[PDB]
């Protein structure tokens, strides 16, 4: 029985593969960063609905997905009232700045509001609570490498103001571009495409987690941003790659 099954499979799968290959043999990614065919008919405005190569993508997890409302509040809010916790995490020359200054407090509140919005988007987009998702850059591995290189020693008060993290994330959210162009439609498409990756980046890089579990310093965070941007740039889908044959 097994031998007969193998013989028929060896005869049927070849024809199946041939038909699959002869239907997408001309599809490719043109230099306009879009997938078309020999008739120049657009099949996808971006390869794989994102425009990224399939080689530089790894499984990851969404921390801000499927939490509890009470846990989500005590993990991404960065309470600025308990000065003892700040002294334990941040240095003395930052606790006073984060307390007295109200602009930092407003900025952190806005960050938490954006985080909540991203969590709602993920819930309405990823039903059934599936944390396992595929994204280009493994931020946890990068953070671990930064810790092991710069010798963070996550016991001492680190020197990294939350505003630095916020501005760094905002700039990295601008540098990573997929749909070039200042046109409103171009910006809308860029936001739509690079949406899940930005949500994951914000969820991993926060003001509380960065100062409790990672304790990265300014130089470490700058190196992390550089590494992330370089890896995302390398992860882009190279135009002129026959994706039809690869899919077949």
Partner 1 sequence: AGILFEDIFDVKDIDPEGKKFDRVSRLHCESESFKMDLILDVNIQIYPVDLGDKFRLVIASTLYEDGTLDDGEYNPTDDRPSRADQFEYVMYGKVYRIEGDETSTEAATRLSAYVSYGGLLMRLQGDANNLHGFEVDSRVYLLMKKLAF
Partner 2 sequence: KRITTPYMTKYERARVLGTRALQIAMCAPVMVELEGETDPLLIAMKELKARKIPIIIRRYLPDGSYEDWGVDELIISD
Partner 3 sequence: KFTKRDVFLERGEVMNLLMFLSTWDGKVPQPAILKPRPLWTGKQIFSLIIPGHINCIRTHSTHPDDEDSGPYKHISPGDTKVVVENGELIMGILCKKSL
d(CA 125, CA 131): 12
Q: How far is the CB of 148 from partner 3 (least distance, A)?
A: 6
Does 140 interact with partner 1 (rule: CB under 8 A)?
no
Does 88 interact with partner 1 (rule: CB under 8 A)?
yes
Does 141 interact with partner 3 (rule: CB under 8 A)?
yes
Q: Provide long-range contacts, Cβ within 8 A and 24+ apart, for 79-87.
A: 79/208, 80/104, 80/105, 80/108, 87/157
Question: Quick one: what does residue 144 bind among partner 1, partner 3, partner 2, none, with the CB cut-off 5 to 8 Å set by partner type?
Answer: partner 3
Contact 79, 90 (CB under 8 A): no
Strand pairing partners for 35? 29, 44
Residue with smaller CB distance to partner 3, 101 or 144: 144
d(CA 108, CA 94): 15
Of 7-15, 48-56, 91-99, 150-158, the segment contacting partner 1 by CB under 8 A is: 150-158
Does 70 interact with partner 1 (rule: CB under 8 A)?
no
Q: How far is the CB of 144 from partner 1 (least distance, A)?
A: 12
Question: Quick one: what does residue 236 bind among partner 1, partner 3, partner 2, none, with the CB cut-off 5 to 8 Å set by partner type?
Answer: partner 2
By three-state DSSP, how is residue 135 classified? strand
Helix boundaries (H) for 126-247: 139-150, 162-175, 184-193, 196-204, 218-235, 243-247
Give the number of residues written for the chain. 248
Q: How far is the CB of 90 from partner 1 (least distance, A)?
A: 13
Does 149 interact with partner 3 (rule: CB under 8 A)?
yes
Strand pairing partners for 89? none
d(CA 118, CA 217): 26
d(CA 46, CA 29): 8
Does 188 interact with partner 2 (rule: CB under 8 A)?
no
Residue with smaller CB distance to partner 2, 30 or 110: 30
d(CA 79, CA 64): 17
Question: Quick one: what does residue 10 bind among partner 3, partner 2, partner 1, none, with the CB cut-off 5 to 8 Å set by partner type?
Answer: none
Footprint on this chain of partner 2 (rule: CB under 8 A): 30-34, 36, 40, 180-181, 233-234, 236, 238-241
Footprint on this chain of partner 1 (rule: CB under 8 A): 82, 84-85, 88, 148, 151, 153-155
Footprint on this chain of partner 3 (rule: CB under 8 A): 141, 144-145, 148-149
């Amino acid at each position: 029985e097994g031998l007969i099954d193998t013989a028929v499979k060896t005869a049927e799968t070849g024809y199946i593969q041939r038909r699959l290959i002869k239907s997408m043999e001309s599809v490719m990614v043109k230099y306009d960063a879009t997938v078309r065919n020999s008739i120049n008919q657009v099949v996808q405005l971006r390869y794989g609905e994102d425009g990224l190569a399939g080689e530089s993508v790894e499984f990851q997890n969404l921390a801000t997905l499927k939490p509890s409302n009470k846990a989500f509040e005590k993990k991404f809010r960065f309470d600025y009232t308990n000065e003892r916790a700040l002294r334990r995490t941040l240095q003395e020359d930052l606790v006073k700045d984060v307390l007295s200054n109200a602009h930092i407090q407003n900025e952190l509140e806005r960050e938490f509001e954006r985080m909540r919005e991203d969590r709602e988007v993920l819930r309405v987009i990823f039903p059934t609570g599936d944390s396992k998702v595929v994204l280009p850059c493994n931020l946890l591995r990068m953070i671990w490498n930064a810790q092991k290189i710069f010798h963070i020693n996550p016991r001492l008060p680190s020197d990294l103001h939350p505003i630095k993290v916020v501005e760094g994330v905002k700039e990295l959210s601008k540098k990573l571009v997929i749909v070039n162009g200042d046109d409103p439609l171009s910006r809308q498409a860029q936001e739509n495409a690079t949406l899940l990756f930005n949500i994951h980046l914000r969820s991993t890089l926060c003001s509380r987690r960065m100062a409790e579990e990672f304790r990265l310093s300014g130089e470490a965070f700058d190196w992390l941003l550089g590494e992330i941007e370089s890896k995302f740039n390398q992860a882009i889908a190279h135009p002129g790659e026959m994706v039809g044959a690869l899919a077949a």
